Each structure stands twice: as structure tokens, then as C-alpha cells.
Amino acid sequence: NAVGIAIDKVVQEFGLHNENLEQRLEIKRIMENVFQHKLPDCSLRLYGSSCSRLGFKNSDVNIDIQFPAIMSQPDVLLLVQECLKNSDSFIDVDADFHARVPVVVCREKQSGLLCKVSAGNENACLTTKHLTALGKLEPKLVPLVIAFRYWAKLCSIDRPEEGGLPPYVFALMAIFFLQQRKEPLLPVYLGSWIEGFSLSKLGNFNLQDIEKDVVIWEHTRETPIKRGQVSLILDVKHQPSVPVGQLWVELLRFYALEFNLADLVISIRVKELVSRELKDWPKKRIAIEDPYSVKRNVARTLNSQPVFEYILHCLRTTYLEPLPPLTPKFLNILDQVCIQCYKDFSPTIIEDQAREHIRQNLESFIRQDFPGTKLSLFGSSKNGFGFKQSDLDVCMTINGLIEELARVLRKHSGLHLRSGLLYNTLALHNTRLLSAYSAIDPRVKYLCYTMKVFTKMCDIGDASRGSLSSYAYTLMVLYFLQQRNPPVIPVLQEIVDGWNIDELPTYWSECGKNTESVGQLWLGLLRFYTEEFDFKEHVISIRRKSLLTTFKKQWTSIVIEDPFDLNHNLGAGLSRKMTNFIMKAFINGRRVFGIPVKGFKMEYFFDPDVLT
């Protein structure tokens, strides 16, 4: 009772009392009239630590929105974002949709509390009911959670951004502790009592919802399958009224000396200990399971090791500068150098006929063993952007329709000594797209050749290195050419495999608008990609001229997109180290090409040592 009184004082100091309960309800009341004008059919379901009243007094307001099946979740939050920004009652509106749960962050003007406006998060909403139901039935639970959470805040363990445990995980720890007690105060919703139960198929069972102080679970629209119900409270009429202080102290003991937090899983659904082997999870760090969410893993939130030992430690104790202005003559020098980069590296007719001869030889040789084959070159060779000593990409195809193919090539003596250099349809299609984009204007080919030489001199463009491929840069340069304020060329898609020049001026209204020199565009590309364009909130894509944020495709982690290959991401294997090197190279290019110098071209501007 001595310690049991101490926690109650903690509850008074940092608990959420009634006056805060209604004050937060008026938050929902004011939200109601904001979303009503544009989304009359939508409704709000209050959730989080507010209804469960397990959080602190100054806890954030967690509010969820429910919409019919016709509307899509991204469409609702986009509309909700507009409804909150144009409201004078709210400030500091932010759109952090790239988190695990897309929510809209805003601060109440009167109270100053942070409101987390989630959408379509039924898992969290139903979780609050379970937490809320237990709190009322178990008056000793609320003091335990508030005191338990308060101690973590002192140690800096409750911060999600820092890597600390999210606040909702702390509620599960307190609930599970009471269940594990040999004199349980709470019942288990899942157990061996159920007919045909077994730990092997524990994942099939799921708690649908709670109604009338009774949990409902289903095993695998109403269907005729095994179903049952379990009460939320053990029906004991003469259990000792032990002080709440003992539970708080015993909680520290169980998780510090008795319960193994490194090789066991916490689950409030069953009494038997669940090991990491059953769920096939690491034993490196703590693992916790949410009742309604049977796939919830706390390892995702807690990846760092020192923090994991820190959790066990604290519990034991309680027991781009501006650049100079450009000059006309230096702009002319930039134009000259770009044109020179086009004219030196462009394959000649003898090289194209040599490629055609190579294609014919390969076609015949493969026809010897695989008659009816049809080969077609692709890549830099025929995309309208030539390049010497470049890889020759070819697409195998058989009319009328890797290990075996390789064995055949070993037979031919020449494999290419002379030159020294399956069903890839999308590659051919984007090759034609790139050729069409190149034929529109000589500046496009000039800047693309300049980009190719720039990436070749900076030791980037290699797939094995993990950096972006040359095709990605070819798309990116077109993205810059299309994104600048004066359009130079349009997106050809707006004007197969589940994926969708003379007369262009007639249809395109802004044809010929840009009159800037080629060197000016080359420097503008660097400026745009180093100072203006943000890679963390936009996606490089030439499918349409409108913006494309990363949240829609959920590519939360440079991002470039294929014109026809939407779901495929070229920067999937892009490691942050390579991104740092890429941006360093681009900054160096801006430095060299943005500082005019009088008196002295290829050997100087594109110097590998200086640029790296």
C-alpha cells in the first residue's frame, strides 16, 4: 500500500484527468464542422491514449477518419490536408505521409496540442477499445501504465523518432505482466481450452472485435467457421485485494531477472511462452506482439542494440553557397565544349555497320542451334544517344513463341575479339521513346552526351557499384529538360506487358518557347538538381508533366521511374554511400562549371582528379 499510494500521486501529477477528456472532445467537435463541407459522408473515430487515458496529460490527440469503400485512403488524406490548411483554428500544418502510418500533423491554436489525423487505421482504433475496456474493469491497470510510461520518459525511451519504443508498446508490457502472474488478474483470450487448439497454428486465430465486455475471436461477411468468446475479466469473487504498488515493483523484477527478453515473445493472447522460432524472428532484440495485429513486430521500431540494453538497464535501476554570375564568353565556351562532347564521342557509320554485322553474326550462330531466332539491338546504340566503347544490348526472341544459351556461345571461337566491345520488349519501347525525344532538338542530344561524359569521368554509372545506370541519367536529363519554367520538349505520353516529330509543333502550344543556350541549360541542370529539386519529396518521372511525390508510390527510400515501367524502381539498390558520392560529384561539377575564369578545355573542365 505504501508504494501503491506513490503511483497514485504520479497519476495525479502526469495522468489525463476528466477536464482533459472533454477538452479533447471539443477538438473532435471543431474537426466535425471542418470536414463536413467537403466530406459530409465521412466520420471520425477517436482513438489512442485519449480514450484509453493511458497516456500523459499533454499527450497528442490521435484521431482517425473512416470513409466508405468507394473512396481511397490517399484521396481522403489529400482532401483532409486541404481542409486543415485553410482553417484559422490550426497552425503548423505538415504532411508527413512517408511514415509507417500516413497522418496529418497539426497543432491546435487554442490548446496547443498536436493532433495526429490518421485515416483508415482500423487496427489502431480497435486496439484502443481493448486498452480502454481493460482500464475501466481493472482500476489498478491505469496507475501501472502511467507510472511505467513516466519512468521511460525520464530515461528517454518513449521517443519513436529517436529509436525508442513507441508509446503503445508500453501498455502491452503492463498487461502481459499481470497475465503471467501465477495468480492471474486477467484471462487469456486464446488457450488450449479451445477445441483443436495448438501452438502450431496460433497465427490463424484473430480477435475480430470486443462487444458487451466480451472479446470475440475467429479462426480460419459471416462464414461458418469455428468461433468463440472469452470474457475480459477473470470471474473471481474472493481474490485478495493486493496493493497496486506490489504489481509495479514485481513488474520490474519479472522483466529484469525472471522473464528472458532476448529469446522470448510477449503475447497477451496465450499463457504459454512463445519463442522466436515459432514466429521466425531474430533473437537479437526485444519482440512484442499486438493482440489485434498478429503481424506487429517491435523489432522494426527497435533496430539499435545499445538502446535494447538501455531498456533493460533503466528497468533494473528502478527495481550550397552562392556562385559568381555567368558571363557571355564563358557561356559561349560552355556551348563549344558541349558541342565538342557530342561530336567526339558519336559513333560513326563504320561503327554502326560493324554493330549491324555483329548482330547478323550472332543471329546466324544462334539460328544454327535455335532456328527461327530473332535478335534486336537496344540500349545506347539505338536510343538516339550514341556512345563509343559502349555495351551492346540485344534482346533475344524466338519466332512462333540462359544456361543453355551460354553453352552455345562457347563453341564460336571469336567470343568480341574483332570489335573489342530474353524478350526485353520494354527496353526496345523505351529505346524508341528516347530516340523520339532526341530527334526533337539538337540541344537534347548535346546535353545527353554531356551527361554521359560527365558520369563517365566521375566514375559513376556502373550497376555493380550500386550507382544509377546510364538509362536512369538519360531519363533524368529529360526530366530537367521538361521541368524548367520554359519548356524545351513535351512529354510524349500525354500528347504491352500490362503497361501503356514533324507535326509536334502543331499540337504543342509551347513549341520553341525556350531560347537559352546549351551551356546555360547544362549549368541550369546542375543548379536545379543541387539547389532546387528535392529528392526526398519528389520522383523523377517523364510520364506526365505534373509533380509526383514519393508518398503515392510509397518509395520512401535518388528515386527515378521508368516511363512505362511504373512499379519498377531503378534506384532500388541505391545505397546512401553512393548517393553521397553522386551528390558530391554533382556539387563539384557545379563548382567547376559555375565559376567563370578568364584565360586557359576538355582536359580542364572534365578532370577526374578535380571532379573527385
Author numbering: 293 to 512, 528 to 626, 987 to 1068, 1080 to 1093, 1111 to 1116, 1122 to 1195, 1206 to 1210, 1217 to 1273, ...
What does the paper say about this structure?
Tumor-suppressor let-7 pre-microRNAs (miRNAs) are regulated by terminal uridylyltransferases TUT7 and TUT4 that either promote let-7 maturation by adding a single uridine nucleotide to the pre-miRNA 3′ end or mark them for degradation by the addition of multiple uridines. Oligo-uridylation is increased in cells by enhanced TUT7/4 expression and especially by the RNA-binding pluripotency factor LIN28A. TUT4 and TUT7 are multidomain enzymes whose specific targeting of RNAs makes use of three zinc fingers, combined with two copies of a nucleotidyltransferase domain (NTD), one inactive in the N-terminal half of the polypeptide (pseudo-NTD) and one active in the C-terminal half. Our structures reveal that pre-miRNAs engage the enzymes in fundamentally different ways depending on the presence of LIN28A, which clamps them onto the TUTs to enable processive 3′ oligo-uridylation.
To visualize the TUT7 apo state we initially isolated the enzyme bound with UTPαS alone but found that modification with NHS-polyethyleneglycol4 (NHS-PEG4)39 was needed to avert excessive sticking of particles to the air–water interface where they are prone to denaturation. The TUT7 structure in an apo state at 4.03 Å revealed an overall ‘C-shape’ conformation composed of two right-handed conformers distinct from the ‘L-shape’ of human Dicer, which in addition remains similar in its conformation throughout its activity cycle. This difference suits Dicer’s role as a ‘tape-measure’ protein capable of recognizing the length associated with a correctly generated pre-miRNA, hence its need for a fixed dimension, whereas the TUTs need to be able to function in two different modes (mono- and oligo-uridylation) and, further, to be able to act processively on a bound pre-miRNA substrate under the influence of LIN28A. In both the apo state and the binary TUT7 complex the two NTDs maintain the distinctive ‘C-shape’, apparently due to their direct interaction with one another. By contrast, in the apo state no obvious density was resolved for the backbone link connecting the LIM and CM, with only a small region of the linking density visible associated with the LIM. Nevertheless, for maintenance of the distinctive ‘C-shape’ structure, the two NTDs of the enzyme must still be interacting directly in the apo state, albeit relatively weakly. After binding to pre-let-7g/LIN28A, the zinc finger in the TUT7 LIM was observed with good density, whereas it was unobserved in TUT7 apo or binary states because of mobility and/or disorder.
